[PDB]
Design a protein around this ligand. Structure first.
Ligand SMILES: OC[C@H]1O[C@@H](O[C@H]2[C@H](O)[C@@H](O)[C@H](O[C@H]3[C@H](O)[C@@H](O)[C@H](O[C@H]4[C@H](O)[C@@H](O)[C@H](O[C@H]5[C@H](O)[C@@H](O)[C@H](O[C@H]6[C@H](O)[C@@H](O)[C@H](O)O[C@@H]6CO)O[C@@H]5CO)O[C@@H]4CO)O[C@@H]3CO)O[C@@H]2CO)[C@H](O)[C@@H](O)[C@@H]1O
Ligand SMILES: OC[C@H]1O[C@@H](O[C@H]2[C@H](O)[C@@H](O)[C@H](O)O[C@@H]2CO)[C@H](O)[C@@H](O)[C@@H]1O
Ligand SMILES: CC(=O)N[C@@H]1[C@@H](O)[C@H](O)[C@@H](CO)O[C@H]1O
Ligand SMILES: *[C@@H]1O[C@H](CO)[C@@H](O)[C@H](O)[C@H]1NC(C)=O
Ligand SMILES: *[C@@H]1O[C@H](CO)[C@@H](O)[C@H](O)[C@H]1NC(C)=O
Ligand SMILES: [Cl-]
Ligand SMILES: [K+]
Ligand SMILES: [K+]
Ligand SMILES: [K+]
Ligand code: NA
Length: 430
């Protein structure tokens, strides 16, 4: 994708902190993912993409399309409901016909910030108070290229500056641009989302979902892949949520997840609970390595919370067969043994391959979305919906009829998530 000229691209400002075993406030900024943008011909206002289909006059091939179509600048607040205030980022849900957003932290105007998380602690504050059933305010990391692909893929000029280069563990085929090619060939409009479709290519890479949550439930989920960085997959071999068989590909779509409610701890997180989601709170996450160095492999993910200045531990599992309050080799083996299903976490290298994702360096993503595929039931309801009574089926209190996108967009359009005070450093430094 090319760089358009009609609207200047100005990344809203967002500060964040680096901490030492003493913190330094870094100047940062955020960009909007390329899928939300206007895509038009080079030096013309003609759309390359309108509604849920491509303009075959310009985009007669995957390559020509990327050479000949440009992404343009965004009105962050006015069109997408994205604002920043100091160290705080607010993502609105419905803004006209726009639904949510996906944003990336920048190191400069043309590069995503890269985080090296092994043997570090990462902290943020969140307000989920305005996130009802069926929404997901996510803060997580993916193994994207810092420059968004510009150095590797010649047709890609727009790069990180225009939010190009997304990949994740679901191998998304809904992306308009992947690896310097447009996703034109085989494009199939979704029958239910007027803006969206699925192309023949998907963009796979490692994903560390440190935070997927709403006011009801939260989960922490590493997802490894066969290779850490971008791998371009084709059609149904992609696996993930955009394919016939989620387990057909090279990334783990399920992950090794820790949701306190799923693990039997139903009084921990939610309205007026131990972590009271009517108010903001701080989430601290540690990435422990086998040898205690930045170059060891990932042994354990640890977690705690702070609210009203009070430290609140991650609660331990109440499910017979699954112990503790950390994610480690024993926990991941125990989860799949007890809850059952496809061993996709092991098959894609588990924590060793998660570490490879992390060692490559990862981009920070903040998003707010609803889910046409599963209505977010996997996060905050009983799932599968016919598995009531079985261990791990219940993930939160939402009804199994909840989370229908057009429903929640009509009823709860004013929903929003605010992320703030991002901090990273050595353990005990944030
Ligand atoms: O025509 C001339 C005039 O153009 C004006 O500019 C227009 C332009 O013409 C128009 O084409 C453009 O339309 C864009 C809309 O403004 C924008 O809202 C819309 O955004 C969609 C996007 O198309 C779609 O791909 C995206 O899909 C989401 C999906 O909903 C979501 O569920 C999924 O969630 C994932 C999470 O992000 C992730 O964290 C998690 O891990 O996984 C989730 C999935 O499991 O993410 C996908 C995307 O990957 O949804 C958004 C939001 O609804 O995009 C339209 C383009 O396709 O608008 C322009 C501005 O109006 C000029 O302004 C004017 O001057 C010209 O004259
Ligand atoms: O694809 C939807 C959602 O799936 C999540 O994994 C589920 C899996 O779908 C379900 O069959 C199993 O019982 O539970 C896992 C974990 O909740 C996955 O973790 C998400 O990233 C994904 O969005
Ligand atoms: C940088 C730093 O302080 N890291 C330590 C970590 O080594 C230790 O295991 C933990 C518990 O004492 O506290 C912290
Ligand atoms: C730049 O675009 C405008 C709008 O299409 C057009 O008037 C002008 O001729 C363009 N430049 C060219 C063709 O070099
Ligand atoms: C249970 O529901 C899932 C999801 O629709 C489906 O795959 C399965 O066939 C259903 N029936 C039974 C008995 O599991
Ligand atoms: Cl869980
Ligand atoms: K601002
Ligand atoms: K994802
Ligand atoms: K309910
Ligand atoms: Na299975």
């Amino acid at each position: 994708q090319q760089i358009g000229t009609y609207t200047a691209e100005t990344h809203p400002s967002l500060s964040w902190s680096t901490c030492k075993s003493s913190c330094t406030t870094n100047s940062g900024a955020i960009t909007l993912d390329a899928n939300w943008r206007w895509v038009h011909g080079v030096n013309t206002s003609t759309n390359c993409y309108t509604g849920n289909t491509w303009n075959s006059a310009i985009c007669d091939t995957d390559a020509s399309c990327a050479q000949d179509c440009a992404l343009d600048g965004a009105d962050y607040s006015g069109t997408y409901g994205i604002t920043t205030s100091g160290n705080s980022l607010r993502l609105n849900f419905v803004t006209g016909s726009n639904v949510g957003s996906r944003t990336y932290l920048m190191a400069d105007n043309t590069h995503y910030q890269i985080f090296d998380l092994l043997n570090q602690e990462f902290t943020f504050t969140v307000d989920v108070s305005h996130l009802p059933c069926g929404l997901n305010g996510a803060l997580y990391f993916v193994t994207m290229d810092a420059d968004g692909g510009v150095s590797k893929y010649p047709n890609n000029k727009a790069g990180a500056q225009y939010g190009v280069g997304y990949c994740d563990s679901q191998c998304p085929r809904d992306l308009k641009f992947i690896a310097g090619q447009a996703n034109v060939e085989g494009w199939t409009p979704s029958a239910n989302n007027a803006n969206t479709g699925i192309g023949n290519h998907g963009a796979c890479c490692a994903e560390l979902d440190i935070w997927e949550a709403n006011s009801i439930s939260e989960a922490l989920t590493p997802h490894p892949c066969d290779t850490p960085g971008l791998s371009v997959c084709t059609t149904d071999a992609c696996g993930g949520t955009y394919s016939s068989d989620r387990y057909a590909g090279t990334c783990d779509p399920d992950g090794c997840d820790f949701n306190p409610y799923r693990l039997g701890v139903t009084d921990f997180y939610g309205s007026g609970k131990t972590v009271d989601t009517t108010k903001p709170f701080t989430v601290v996450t540690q990435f422990v390595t086998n040898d205690g160095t930045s170059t060891g492999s990932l042994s354990e993910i640890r977690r705690y919370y702070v609210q009203n200045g009070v430290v609140i531990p991650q609660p331990s599992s109440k499910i017979s067969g699954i112990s503790g309050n950390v994610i480690n080799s024993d926990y991941c083996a125990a989860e799949i043994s007890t809850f059952g299903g496809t061993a996709s976490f092991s098959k894609h290298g588990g924590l060793t391959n998660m570490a490879a994702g992390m060692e490559a360096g990862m981009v920070l993503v903040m998003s707010l979305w609803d889910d046409y595929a599963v209505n977010m039931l996997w996060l905050d309801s009983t799932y599968p919906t016919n598995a009531t009574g079985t261990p791990g089926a219940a993930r939160g209190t939402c009804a199994t009829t909840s989370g229908d996108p057009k429903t929640v967009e009509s009823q709860s359009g004013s929903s929003y998530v605010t992320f703030s005070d991002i901090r990273v450093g050595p353990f005990n430094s944030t």
